[PDB]
Amino acid sequence: AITADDIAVQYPIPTYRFIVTLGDEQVPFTSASGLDINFDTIEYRDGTGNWFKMPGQRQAPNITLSKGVFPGKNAMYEWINAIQLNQVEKKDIMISLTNEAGTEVLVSWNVSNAFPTSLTSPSFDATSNEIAVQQITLMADRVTIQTA
């Protein structure tokens, strides 16, 4: 007897159900990785034996999003095609673990000013039963988590 309204509060959350809001729109992705929060470290030792350890300053995240190639338009391509030498429409990304029906966000990760730095083509292979998958790598400045 566990009555699955208690599963929604007590049990953990699986990885396979997620939505990615990218700017003003949602794009269906297959994978999403790299949303880390990493710090540097500062030290100091003196001759009497005191050894001080401090957090440094955090470095920038590298997000990786992969989806399939569809017969419409390539919406990841027209955001990496429009790089003019310094300039890029920087977007804010939300990657939200969602429930089955899709009507409730469980926990989400917020990427703030992301811009594309790489886009890989699918690997064409005449002996493979696979889907054409592109992946895009993004560079941001902070990653936050809101838990609601």
Binding site: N99, E100, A101, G102, T103
Partner: protein
Amino acid sequence: ALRLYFQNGGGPCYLYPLEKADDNGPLAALPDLIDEVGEITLLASPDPDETYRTAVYGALAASLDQHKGYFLLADSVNGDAPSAVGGSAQVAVYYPNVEVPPLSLPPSALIAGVYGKTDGERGVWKAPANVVLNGVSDVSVRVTNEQQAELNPKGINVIRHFSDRGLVVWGSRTQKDDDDWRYIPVRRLFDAAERDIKKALQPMVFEPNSQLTWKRVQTAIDNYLYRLWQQGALAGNKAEEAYFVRVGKGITMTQDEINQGKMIIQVGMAAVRPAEFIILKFTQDM
């Protein structure tokens, strides 16, 4: 008006050339020619004359309440419904005339474009009311909030101008003031689901009216309503809260109704309503 239609999202785009307004011959023969073609959904007559549209809106008003699934896109003249179609749920009025580099066009040719753009990208259950109008530059009347506040509790659906965005269609209400059929995306979801169920059950006409056929019809509707729920159209969380299909002999029919050759099916759905008011409530106490 057609070039602004294809710039805003094209389509198969049926046309009916009707030269002058007062020829009551071709206007009386108009609703019989619409039924001969299978696939008209919107009406939306794009003409700048005022008395021309009133003759068209009056000739098409009798075909809107006949469960055929049409949807009229009327145009206001000075801020009210054109009164040939008063309070039916099949009508969406759009007030401001839109100016093109300057000739002023009624906005129905553009809004018929942005329905096809919204339905292709988001579905019929999405409110078609944040689309920026391509082509055109400025509306003929810049509408304030205070006159939209007396217009939006009618179905007037003002084309607004925002400085950062441009010309945004702003409003998704129908002429019906009922709680059920207040919004455009709730109304056109039911019109599109009834149209696609009807196209799926016409192979099951002139079948033997037996209990084996009634289950083949129930499954064909249940397979359709399941793949609306799993793409976000229906407002449910369990798929028994989204829809139901019922058919039987003790349920929904009597034995005298089978003998006259008909089957009766009860289908229900549950749609989601859009968020049209956002209240911010700032403070500086903490």
